Homo-oligomer: A and B are copies of this chain.
Amino acid sequence: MVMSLLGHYNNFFFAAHLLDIAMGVKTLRTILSSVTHNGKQLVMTVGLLAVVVYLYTVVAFNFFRKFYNKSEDEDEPDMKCDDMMTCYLFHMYVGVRAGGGIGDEIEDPAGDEYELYRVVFDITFFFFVIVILLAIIQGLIIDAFG
């Protein structure tokens, strides 16, 4: 009701009333209950993901700042890891969303003294973050169905 009254003020608030399909339909309610069943576990999986990304951000801030320029123009560099907060935001935002991880979004290390360190960095980010934790989320949902 409050959202309807707010819709009278701005009609786009009437969209929230479409979420009632969950309560109306038993099937959607069951599907959502599958998610809610292990919701606390999913939340803590997300927290663990954040911790892992924070550790990776710390490593990058210490050793791999040079690779985090996202500016094509040499005159105006845009460095995403000169500050720890920016580096963390960059990781959690782009690397998690990327298929191959942060290595997909940061500058190639070929012909660099830290090339092997960074390949380990990228591949470990990819497996742990992208593969395993996400896999854990799907597995939680599947186990809820069962």
Which residues of A are in contact with B by a Cβ distance under 8 Å?
Answer: 12, 15-16, 18-19, 21-22, 25, 27-28, 30-31, 34-35, 40-41, 44-45, 47-48, 51, 54-55, 58, 62, 78, 89, 92-94, 96-101, 103-104, 110, 119, 122-123, 126, 131-132, 134-146
**A51 and B21 contact, CB distance less than 8 A:** yes
Closest B-chain residue to A78, C-beta based? B110
**A48 and B35 contact, CB distance less than 8 A:** no
**B35 and A47 contact, CB distance less than 8 A:** no
A-B pairs with the 7 shortest C-beta distances? A97-B100, A139-B142, A135-B138, A143-B145, A139-B141, A27-B44, A135-B141
Which residues of the partner chain B approach A99 to less than 8 Å between Cβ atoms?
Answer: 97-99
**B21 and A47 contact, CB distance less than 8 A:** yes
Closest B-chain residue to A35, C-beta based? B132
Minimal beta-carbon separation of A47 from chain B (angstroms): 7
Which residues of the partner chain B approach A40 to less than 8 Å between Cβ atoms?
Answer: 27
Q: Which of the residues B51, B123, B146 comes within 8 Å of A97, measured between beta carbons?
A: B123
